[PDB]
Amino acid sequence: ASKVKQDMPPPGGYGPIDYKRNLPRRGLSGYSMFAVGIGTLLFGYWSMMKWNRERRRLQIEDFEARIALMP
Amino acid sequence: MFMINILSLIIPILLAVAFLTLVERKVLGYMQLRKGPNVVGPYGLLQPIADALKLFTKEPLRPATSSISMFIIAPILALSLALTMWVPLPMPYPLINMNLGVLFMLAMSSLAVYSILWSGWASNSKYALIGALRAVAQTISYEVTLAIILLSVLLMNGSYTLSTLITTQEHIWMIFTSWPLAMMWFISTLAETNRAPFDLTEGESELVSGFNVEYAAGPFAMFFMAEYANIIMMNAFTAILFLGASHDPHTPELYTINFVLKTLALTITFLWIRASYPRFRYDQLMHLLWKSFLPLTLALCMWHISLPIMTASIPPQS
Ligand SMILES: CCCCCCCC/C=C\CCCCCCCC(=O)O[C@H](COC(=O)CCCCCCC/C=C/CCCCCCCC)COP(=O)(O)OCCN
């Protein structure tokens, strides 16, 4: 006298299954990104300004060495 | 002794191209939840050798309707130019020291488009012709913008000498000064190397194989070698242009290691990009390069001309 055994869902039911789209925001604001970009640009401009002025002075020194050696 | 230097530049570049293909396959595989070549040699390290040996022992085909001279010449020109573009690069010392090295790369890159043009036209098949015309459109799209970007960036270097770029970036990377130009330069290098999402000349899903559809065995291998050598060369040029490694005159291999690491990072970024985006349409590529990149590039060219005078920051050289 064996009872019926068959593939059935568990008593109660199965757990919920997600189906809706899940695309989070995961980002900053436009103002923040623009601000960081401009800040990086300004820092780079300042550094290159100092470096290029120093390079101009070094080139002047090299040219003076050449001038002293020319005669 | 200069011949030995030529060989020491040429053979390692070809070796790096061969293994770049293995790296490209593995990176794409792991980004696609698979493994890629791991059977032919430990970790697939012998796969490029098997590919090279298979390709050069396979029968090369000469199409009946083809023009024989251009058909044979085009791959030779492609591979020779790809090898030639490496000679002025400072790592940290160039094999050839040019006053205008940047102009040299510009001219040779402009002459490398003819291998795809002559190959496609001399194949005398319809898909090859469509690929060649797509190459024409691609060059028309990117050339002017790339040249103006190069000029705007080099305005802060003071010359077209490539080694001077090391001196310019002794304290700071040029990407912190011209990141808006760096982004456009990176996209234009993707467009110039016929890489995804700008791989229209081949266009496997649309044109079967594009300009090289009729090529087989060794000539096809040379076209592939030229393309991947161009990838590595362009990324090395970008690394020199925007990420300047510090150079110690008594310790140059430190610079060499730094530069190679940056070049590998940029090449891996190329492979990463190929695995993430759909292909452009070639009219859409032309519109992107002429309606967005061109106006911004012109404005930034004016800005980078005015800025050094504005702040008294003109570079040294005449
Ligand atoms: C105080 C003043 C100083 C100067 C001021 C400067 C401020 C600059 C502010 C803006 C700078 C932005 C620069 C960006 C230039 C191009 C941006 C752009 O607009 O292009 C897009 C599109 O550009 C793209 O998206 C290209 C697509 C291809 C993507 C390929 C891979 C993505 C890039 C990967 C990362 C790149 C990393 C670059 C740096 C590497 C190191 C060099 C336009 O396309 P559409 O959306 O269709 O709009 C037009 C039609 N309505």
Side-chain angles (χ1 to χ4, degrees), chain A residues 1-24 27-71, chain B:
Chain A
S2 298
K3 48 133 55 183
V4 156
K5 187 45 179 137
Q6 200 181 31
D7 200 31
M8 287 291 279
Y14 281 114
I17 290 166
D18 288 4
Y19 60 93
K20 285 160 189 281
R21 164 151 82 196
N22 193 3
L23 293 192
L28 254 186
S29 55
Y31 295 119
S32 206
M33 306 183 208
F34 284 133
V36 184
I38 312 295
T40 305
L41 282 181
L42 295 170
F43 172 74
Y45 294 162
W46 194 79
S47 283
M48 197 55 36
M49 178 225 293
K50 316 270 244 153
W51 181 223
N52 273 353
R53 279 173 195 169
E54 172 66 11
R55 283 167 86 198
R56 287 315 278 263
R57 290 186 288 262
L58 295 161
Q59 189 196 53
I60 284 167
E61 177 186 26
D62 215 288
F63 285 10
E64 273 161 1
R66 166 182 182 243
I67 271 163
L69 288 180
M70 275 182 78
Chain B
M1 254 301 152
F2 183 77
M3 198 43 212
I4 303 206
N5 220 350
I6 289 178
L7 297 182
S8 299
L9 179 81
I10 288 328
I11 310 305
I13 285 307
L14 287 180
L15 264 45
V17 167
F19 280 90
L20 168 46
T21 60
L22 165 66
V23 169
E24 155 89 312
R25 286 162 71 170
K26 291 203 73 68
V27 159
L28 262 281
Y30 273 100
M31 261 177 186
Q32 287 160 348
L33 208 67
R34 42 183 187 92
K35 292 201 169 177
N38 74 325
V39 169
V40 188
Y43 311 104
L45 281 176
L46 283 173
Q47 185 80 69
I49 293 97
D51 287 311
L53 249 170
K54 189 263 292 176
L55 276 183
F56 271 95
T57 59
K58 204 177 179 78
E59 178 185 29
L61 254 164
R62 250 146 33 209
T65 69
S66 75
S67 304
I68 202 46
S69 291
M70 253 179 185
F71 192 84
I72 264 64
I73 275 167
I76 294 168
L77 170 80
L79 182 64
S80 77
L81 282 178
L83 292 173
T84 314
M85 305 262 315
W86 280 89
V87 323
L89 286 178
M91 307 136 83
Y93 309 116
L95 173 82
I96 301 287
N97 216 325
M98 329 199 153
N99 258 301
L100 330 172
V102 184
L103 298 189
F104 177 76
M105 329 258 291
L106 262 191
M108 302 282 95
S109 102
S110 248
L111 156 74
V113 188
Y114 294 86
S115 32
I116 292 174
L117 288 188
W118 294 337
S119 158
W121 179 89
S123 295
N124 202 356
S125 58
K126 295 197 182 76
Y127 284 103
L129 188 72
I130 298 169
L133 265 307
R134 280 179 172 201
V136 163
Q138 194 132 345
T139 302
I140 281 164
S141 309
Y142 71 73
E143 184 62 30
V144 179
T145 305
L146 191 128
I148 303 179
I149 288 159
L150 218 33
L151 163 74
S152 305
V153 171
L154 291 166
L155 280 161
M156 207 75 189
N157 190 45
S159 66
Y160 293 103
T161 307
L162 289 164
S163 51
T164 313
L165 281 157
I166 299 170
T167 304
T168 297
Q169 315 185 73
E170 207 186 58
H171 308 296
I172 201 183
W173 289 352
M174 264 217 87
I175 202 179
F176 300 117
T177 315
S178 41
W179 65 261
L181 285 172
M183 314 183 33
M184 299 207 246
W185 168 263
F186 195 81
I187 302 303
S188 322
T189 54
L190 283 158
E192 196 257 345
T193 43
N194 307 297
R195 282 295 295 195
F198 308 122
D199 52 332
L200 280 316
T201 64
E202 326 89 283
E204 217 89 20
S205 72
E206 291 125 31
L207 303 180
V208 179
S209 203
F211 78 98
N212 56 21
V213 69
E214 297 281 8
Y215 279 87
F220 168 79
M222 311 157 89
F223 271 126
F224 222 69
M225 296 153 80
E227 209 253 5
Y228 275 69
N230 283 326
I231 302 319
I232 310 180
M233 173 285 294
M234 222 81 212
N235 277 312
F237 188 25
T238 299
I240 287 157
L241 202 57
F242 287 106
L243 322 168
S246 280
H247 170 44
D248 199 327
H250 286 99
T251 332
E253 57 287 328
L254 264 51
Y255 180 98
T256 312
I257 290 155
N258 215 263
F259 152 83
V260 166
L261 284 175
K262 280 158 187 174
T263 303
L264 280 184
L266 287 172
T267 305
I268 292 330
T269 312
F270 260 40
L271 318 181
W272 183 10
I273 276 166
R274 179 183 169 185
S276 303
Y277 302 121
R279 190 182 293 117
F280 261 77
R281 235 168 65 207
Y282 78 129
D283 70 315
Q284 294 174 340
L285 161 66
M286 179 165 311
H287 284 130
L288 162 81
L289 256 284
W290 279 68
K291 291 187 175 176
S292 279
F293 277 27
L294 193 55
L296 250 192
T297 304
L298 291 177
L300 281 169
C301 191
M302 316 165 72
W303 173 251
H304 279 266
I305 292 161
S306 279
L307 170 75
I309 304 164
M310 257 171 34
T311 65
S313 314
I314 294 167
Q317 220 55 69
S318 317

